[PDB]
Every structure is written in C-alpha cells, then in structure tokens.
Scaffold this active site. Structure first.
Site, PDB file in Angstrom:
ATOM      1  N   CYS B  14       0.810  -1.212   0.000  1.00  0.00           N
ATOM      2  CA  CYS B  14       0.000   0.000   0.000  1.00  0.00           C
ATOM      3  C   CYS B  14       0.846   1.265   0.000  1.00  0.00           C
ATOM      4  O   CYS B  14       0.360   2.321  -0.423  1.00  0.00           O
ATOM      5  CB  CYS B  14      -0.928   0.013   1.214  1.00  0.00           C
ATOM      6  SG  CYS B  14      -0.066   0.119   2.801  1.00  0.00           S
ATOM      7  N   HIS B 261      -1.053   1.344   7.611  1.00  0.00           N
ATOM      8  CA  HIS B 261      -1.667   1.225   6.295  1.00  0.00           C
ATOM      9  C   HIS B 261      -1.759   2.605   5.665  1.00  0.00           C
ATOM     10  O   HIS B 261      -2.173   3.563   6.325  1.00  0.00           O
ATOM     11  CB  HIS B 261      -3.062   0.590   6.389  1.00  0.00           C
ATOM     12  CG  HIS B 261      -3.778   0.498   5.077  1.00  0.00           C
ATOM     13  ND1 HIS B 261      -3.262  -0.176   3.991  1.00  0.00           N
ATOM     14  CD2 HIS B 261      -4.973   0.995   4.677  1.00  0.00           C
ATOM     15  CE1 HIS B 261      -4.108  -0.091   2.980  1.00  0.00           C
ATOM     16  NE2 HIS B 261      -5.154   0.615   3.370  1.00  0.00           N
TER      17      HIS B 261
END
Ligand SMILES: [Zn+2]
Lengths: 75, 304
Positions: B14, B261
């Site tokens: 990510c 994240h």
C-alpha cells in the site's frame, strides 16, 4: 569541515566531519547528540536520500551544508 | 461514474499504491513524464512509471478495474532500492527513490533542452554571526519535498499547515559554528527560505518524532490544511509573482510506527471537484469534507 543537520523538531545542529567520512559515520555522530540509531535515520540532501556506504565526497557535500533528518514510517 | 482503477496489494505494498494514486492525480507531473519519455520514441524507470500513472490518471475502462503496480517495484528492487516484496515501507522514502531515479535518468538523457521534473524546488539558507553580525553568503540546495516537523499540540489550539510551514521558515539560533570574521566558535542565526518554487509541491508532514525516553512516537494530531494554499509568505525574495497552489491528493497513514496502512484521497479525473477514497484495490466516492478531516501525511499541491 563543518556541516548542519536539520533535526526532527526543526532545530539545526552542527557537526564536525571530513569529506572522506561515510554517512554511517555521520549517522553515528547524529546518534551521539540526538540518540537516534543510524538504522532508523534517513538523511536527505539535495532531494537525495543518502545511502549508507558512500562518503560525503560522492554526494559533493561541502562546508556549511544542511542535511535533513527524518524517520521511516512504514505502512 | 468517475472512478479510477484500484491497485492490488500483493504484500504490504500500500505504500506504493497510495503514492501512485497521489502522483497520477498531479496532471503537471504526468505531462512532464510524457514530454520526458517522448525522446525514447526517437530499460528505464520513467516508462514503467508513466504506464501506471497514465492508467490511474483516467477513469477506469472497465467496472471495478484493478491494476497491479509491482512491475514498478521489481525494477526498483533490481537497480535502485534493495527491499523485499512483502515488508512495510515508507511512502515518502519511495517518493525520493522515484524522484532520484528520474533525476539520474534525465542526467543521462540526450535532450537537455527539457525541463527538470515539476517536483524539483530550491531552498535558500542565510546565516549571520550573532557576535560580529557578518552575514555569510546565500546557499541554495534543491528539494523534492518539504518535510515539516509537527509542533507541539494543545487542546483547543488549532494546528495548521501554515503554522508548520512558518516554523520550517522561522529563524533559529545555531550554537558553536566557526565564523570567518571572528576566525574563532560562536552562535549563528540561520533561516531557510524558498528560492524556486516547484510546479508540483509535495508536503511531507513528519508523523514520527523522537520521545524523551528514546523511542519513536507516532504523531496522531490532525493538521488543518486547505484546498487552496498560498506560498507567497515563504519566498526568499520579494518576488511580485504570486504563488497559488491547489490540493490534488492526500496520502494518509493509519496505525502506529511498526504497523500501518497507507490510504489516498484524490480528485476524480475528468474522463474535477469530486473526490475519491482509494485504499489499494477499493475506490469510493468521498466528499471534500472527509478529505479535509483526514490525517494528512503527504500533501500534493499543484501551482495554478
Ligand atoms: Zn563572527
């Protein structure tokens, strides 16, 4: 010579270095006064993140140069 | 529906997918890449990078389109950045790998009449001894992003991007520097300003500090930022040319220091004022209110 490192808070410390010094040597000197392990340091100069292994000669870091110190935030 | 393609996450990737969504939302950057890679029609990082960004800068061509960007990571893993293909990494470190690779690729290119990439800016450093008031000359260094320290936060006291910028530009006392006049050391006054502003401005908000104990600290504080950003107050010279920037994308980091994240808010592409929340393979419509309330980590502004 003599260079500057812009630290995490924005304060700029002064370091005594030689053009033959590696930046792992410089990260060691930042650890001496800031307590940051070298493996956790990211030194940026002229938009380039400095690669441990090279010296300040390969990056052409001259006197009164300002390096910028930032940490590594993984995701 | 004006939705962009998503990107698959093939192992904590990510950090790449969020950066690519942000970069493809900067039209001036993509136009520069097209100009730069046009000389190859007379391997390389720019060609692999443009293929992904050109696709991500337009609305999806199929419903719920998902692309894979790890071809980019493969070439960086081979030649520029030695990392695994599964470990979490910093999207800002990747931004500097990409930006360094493109400057190296341009230095070896044959069409030197073309401009540097639009993220490239230059900062000034002025210095004067406090003892003898002898101003050292000006020093210009380039930058590809501004890494701003997040000041201390108080309840009820807003924390704005303008404050972070002024702190980056404020003058400071630098102790124990040799002087060329006093021959000496002595305490200097140092200040950084912005000489040349880039057409594409990447703002890095440092969400990692060092604690008094001796361990990193995630900075969760919300830093207020605006869709419109005026950079006039931070210029070195008294340039009468205005410097107005518009928000193109935000990269947001959720989680702590070790785990985390990356997510991206970006504008929808015109085939405008509609926003998207992109989390790897998932693309949702988002309102500008959600965008301005996010915890920004990388801010992408483009000069208007
Ligand atoms: Zn002096």
């Amino acid at each position: 010579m003599q260079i500057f490192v812009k630290t995490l808070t924005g304060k700029t410390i002064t370091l005594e270095v030689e053009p033959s010094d590696t930046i792992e040597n410089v990260k060691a000197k930042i650890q001496d006064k800031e307590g940051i392990p070298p493996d956790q340091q990211r030194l940026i100069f002229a938009g380039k993140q400095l690669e441990d292994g090279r010296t300040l000669s390969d990056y052409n870091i001259q006197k009164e140069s300002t390096l910028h110190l930032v940490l590594r935030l993984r995701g | 529906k004006g939705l962009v393609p998503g990107l698959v996450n093939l192992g904590n990737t990510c950090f790449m997918n969020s950066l690519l969504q942000g970069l493809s939302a900067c039209p001036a950057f993509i136009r520069w890449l097209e100009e730069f890679t046009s000389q190859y029609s007379r391997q390389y990082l720019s060609l692999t990078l443009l293929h992904l960004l050109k696709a991500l800068s337009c609305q999806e061509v199929t419903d719920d389109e998902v692309l894979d960007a790890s071809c980019l990571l493969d070439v960086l893993r081979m030649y520029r950045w030695q990392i695994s293909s599964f470990e979490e990494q910093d999207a800002h470190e990747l931004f500097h790998v990409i930006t360094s690779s493109l400057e190296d690729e341009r230095d070896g290119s044959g069409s030197h009449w073309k401009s540097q990439h639009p993220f490239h800016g230059r900062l000034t450093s002025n210095m004067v001894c406090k003892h003898c008031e002898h101003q050292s000359p000006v020093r210009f260094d380039t930058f590809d992003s501004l890494s701003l320290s997040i000041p201390a936060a108080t309840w009820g006291h807003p924390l704005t991007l303008d404050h972070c910028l002024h702190h980056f530009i404020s003058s400071e006392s630098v102790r124990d520097v040799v002087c060329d006049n006093c021959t000496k050391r002595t305490t200097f006054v140092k200040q950084l300003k912005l000489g040349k502003l880039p057409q594409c401005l990447c703002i890095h908000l440092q969400r990692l500090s060092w604690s008094s104990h001796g361990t990193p600290l995630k900075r969760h504080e919300h830093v207020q930022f605006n869709e419109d950003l005026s950079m006039d107050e931070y210029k070195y010279h008294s340039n009468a040319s205005t410097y107005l920037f518009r928000l193109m994308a935000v990269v947001v980091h959720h989680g702590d220091m070790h785990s985390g994240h990356f997510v991206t808010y970006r504008r929808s592409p015109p085939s405008s004022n509609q926003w998207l929340w992109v989390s790897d393979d998932t693309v949702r419509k988002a309102s500008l209110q959600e965008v301005l309330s996010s915890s920004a980590y990388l801010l992408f502004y483009e000069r208007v």
